[PDB]
Design a protein around this nucleic acid. Sequence first.
RNA 1: UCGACA
DNA 2: ATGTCG
Length: 133
Amino acid sequence: EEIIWESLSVDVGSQGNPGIVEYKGVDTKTGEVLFEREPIPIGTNNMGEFLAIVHGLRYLKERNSRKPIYSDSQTAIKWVKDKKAKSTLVRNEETALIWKLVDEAEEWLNTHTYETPILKWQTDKWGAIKADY
RNA sequence: UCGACA
DNA sequence: ATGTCG
Ligand SMILES: [Mg+2]
Ligand SMILES: [Mg+2]
């Protein structure tokens, strides 16, 4: 019910789905952009949302921050929780990059620890997530 | 299919 | 329209 302003918010920006995917993380309070991923030619919205959360986890861990992460992606939150991105995107030559990033994200997750709460941003009550494009 | 999150 | 979960 309460927005934890002392947090990191992430979100994906896409052009087509499957289509070009990029993502960024911002300070929920100030909107300051803390990180951005170079656009990936082909990927799905959910894969980008997943990557955004995992990158967020790595970003906070490297800085010893215990701040939670907000994502408005039901799918990505579950994937991170299970440490498994159950994407249906075909694995082929043009989806090689997004899949490599997804695979490496899962890999990091299974080899590192964190207590970072991953919270659902309630868009229907609070409006667009702060990392929205 | 329905409901939901994008 | 397309990607995913409950
Ligand atoms: Mg989103
Ligand atoms: Mg949005």
